[PDB]
């Protein structure tokens, strides 16, 4: 069968916790007062919930209310427990309250408001300095979560709220997040297509925090190369092929061979034989101002097939790409 894998950092953190920390099924939800909140505008309807802008009529604070839907009910307490576990951490969205919506009769999570600009428009305006600055801010959130025994599993531009006026960033939507336990097998049907790590695409279930570092790399590549998305697959199978056309097939085979993983046989007729490309292949007059040797080296160390070989969030924060960022 597959060779096992463990995280190379924060490996054992949950084992030292009281069971209550990670045993989210046993969590008793604490409820606030739904009458404190007035919905103002529906902002969207994800897979699992409807999201609204609202006002806390008690303090006049703008808030965001996510009225939970789901059919995998376990996700309710998992998200709540993860949010409570991470509350107060750097760049982690703050869960302000949990109320029972009287119409849906389901929990509604109340979050702090962040004044965001649509990433498709915003990313066209980020300078080189800004990309470095905000990447560093995302890393603070990821390293905090990972240090707390949690993987986000859905890192993507839509889940990074940026108030660019105030240079404020929050990592949101912890509904796919999980507790990391060594040796545990996880669902590979997580993350959005363009951000799924190779471990998901080859059906390797014993993954870890390093999944989030792939997704961060895929975001970074889109930002520095002005290519949205960077790896633009039509489906989850073609998604792997798009990755292999950049990173090469030999290193893909080495990865699956290391873990004694066999590709879905449907790859036989679509994967082909591709060399690893040099990153300069993607540089052109329109993105050159965002590219530097340090950016390319950092990216190269995030976008690795072998999840164990990727930079950790803390290693990433040590990288020369961030030396120019004021701290």
UniProtKB/Swiss-Prot annotation:
* Activity regulation as described: Constitutively active protein kinase whose activity is not directly affected by phosphorylation. Seems to be regulated by level of expression and localization.
Keywords (alphabetical) are: Apoptosis, ATP-binding, Biological rhythms, Cell cycle, Disease variant, Intellectual disability, Kinase, Nucleotide-binding, Nucleus, Phosphoprotein, Serine/threonine-protein kinase, Transcription, Transcription regulation, Transferase, Wnt signaling pathway
Q: Which GO terms describe its molecular function?
A: ATP binding; Hsp90 protein binding; identical protein binding; kinase activity; protein serine kinase activity; protein serine/threonine kinase activity
Q: Which reaction does it catalyse?
A: L-seryl-[protein] + ATP = O-phospho-L-seryl-[protein] + ADP + H(+); L-threonyl-[protein] + ATP = O-phospho-L-threonyl-[protein] + ADP + H(+)
The biological process GO terms on file are: apoptotic process; chaperone-mediated protein folding; DNA damage response; double-strand break repair; negative regulation of apoptotic signaling pathway; negative regulation of double-strand break repair via homologous recombination; negative regulation of proteasomal ubiquitin-dependent protein catabolic process; negative regulation of signal transduction by p53 class mediator
Give the tissue specificity: Expressed in gastric carcinoma tissue and the expression gradually increases with the progression of the carcinoma (at protein level).
Key word Glycoprotein present: no
Q: How is it modified after translation?
A: Phosphorylation does not directly affect casein kinase 2 activity, but may contribute to its regulation by forming binding sites for interacting proteins and/or targeting it to different compartments.
Enzyme Commission identifier(s): 2.7.11.1
Q: Where in the cell is it found?
A: Nucleus
Q: Which residues bind ATP?
A: 43-51, 66
GO CC annotations?
cytosol; nucleoplasm; nucleus; plasma membrane; PML body; protein kinase CK2 complex; Sin3-type complex
Annotated region Interaction with beta subunit: the residues are 34-39
Q: Which residues act catalytically here? A: 154 (proton acceptor)
- Protein kinase domain mapped to chain residues: 37-322
The UniProt entry's sequence similarity note says: Belongs to the protein kinase superfamily. Ser/Thr protein kinase family. CK2 subfamily.
Give the misc comment: Can use both ATP and GTP as phosphoryl donors. Phosphorylation by casein kinase 2 has been estimated to represent up to one quarter of the eukaryotic phosphoproteome. Casein kinase 2 has been found to be increased at protein level and up-regulated at the level of enzyme activity in the majority of cancers. However, elevated levels of casein kinase 2 are present in certain normal organs such as brain and testes.
Q: What job does this protein perform?
A: Catalytic subunit of a constitutively active serine/threonine-protein kinase complex that phosphorylates a large number of substrates containing acidic residues C-terminal to the phosphorylated serine or threonine. Regulates numerous cellular processes, such as cell cycle progression, apoptosis and transcription, as well as viral infection. May act as a regulatory node which integrates and coordinates numerous signals leading to an appropriate cellular response.
Record text on subunit structure and interactions: Heterotetramer composed of two catalytic subunits (alpha chain and/or alpha' chain) and two regulatory subunits (beta chains). The tetramer can exist as a combination of 2 alpha/2 beta, 2 alpha'/2 beta or 1 alpha/1 alpha'/2 beta subunits. Also part of a CK2-SPT16-SSRP1 complex composed of SSRP1, SUPT16H, CSNK2A1, CSNK2A2 and CSNK2B, which forms following UV irradiation. Interacts with RNPS1. Interacts with SNAI1. Interacts with PML (isoform PML-12). Interacts with CCAR2. Interacts with HIRIP3.
What disease involvement is noted? Okur-Chung neurodevelopmental syndrome: An autosomal dominant neurodevelopmental disorder characterized by developmental delay, intellectual disability, behavioral problems, hypotonia, speech problems, microcephaly, pachygyria and variable dysmorphic features.
Protein name (Swiss-Prot/TrEMBL): Casein kinase II subunit alpha
């Amino acid at each position: 069968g597959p060779v096992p894998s463990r995280a190379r950092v924060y490996t054992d953190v949950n084992t030292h916790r009281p069971r209550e920390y990670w045993d989210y099924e046993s969590h008793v939800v604490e409820w606030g007062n739904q009458d404190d909140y007035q919905l103002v505008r529906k902002l969207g309807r994800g897979k699992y919930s409807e999201v609204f802008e609202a006002i806390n009529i008690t303090n006049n604070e703008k808030v965001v209310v996510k009225i939970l839907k789901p059919v995998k009910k376990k996700k309710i307490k998992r998200e709540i427990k993860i949010l409570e576990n991470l509350r107060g951490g750097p760049n982690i969205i703050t869960l302000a309250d949990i109320v029972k919506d009287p119409v849906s009769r389901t929990p509604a999570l109340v979050f702090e408001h962040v004044n965001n600009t649509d990433f498709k428009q915003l990313y066209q305006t980020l300078t080189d300095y800004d990309i470095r600055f905000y990447m560093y801010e995302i890393l603070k959130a990821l390293d905090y979560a990972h240090s707390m025994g949690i993987m986000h599993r859905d890192v993507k531009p839509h889940n990074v709220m940026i108030d660019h006026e105030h240079r404020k960033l929050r990592l949101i939507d912890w509904g796919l997040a999980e507790f990391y336990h060594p040796g545990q097998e996880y669902n590979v049907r997580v993350a959005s297509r363009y951000f799924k790590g190779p471990e998901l695409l080859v059906d390797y279930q014993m993954y870890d925090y390093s999944l989030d570092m792939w997704s961060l790399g895929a975001m970074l590549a889109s930002m520095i190369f002005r290519k949205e998305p960077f790896f633009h697959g039509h489906d989850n199978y073609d998604q792997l092929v798009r990755i292999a056309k950049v990173l090469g097939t030999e290193d893909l085979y080495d990865y699956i061979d290391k873990y004694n993983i066999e590709l879905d046989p449907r790859f036989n007729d679509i994967l082909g034989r591709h060399s690893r490309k040099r990153w300069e292949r993607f540089v052109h007059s329109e993105n050159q101002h965002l590219v530097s040797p340090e950016a390319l080296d950092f990216l190269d160390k995030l976008l690795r097939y072998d999840h164990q070989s990727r930079l950790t969030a803390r290693e990433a924060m040590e990288h020369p790409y961030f030396y120019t960022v004021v701290k």
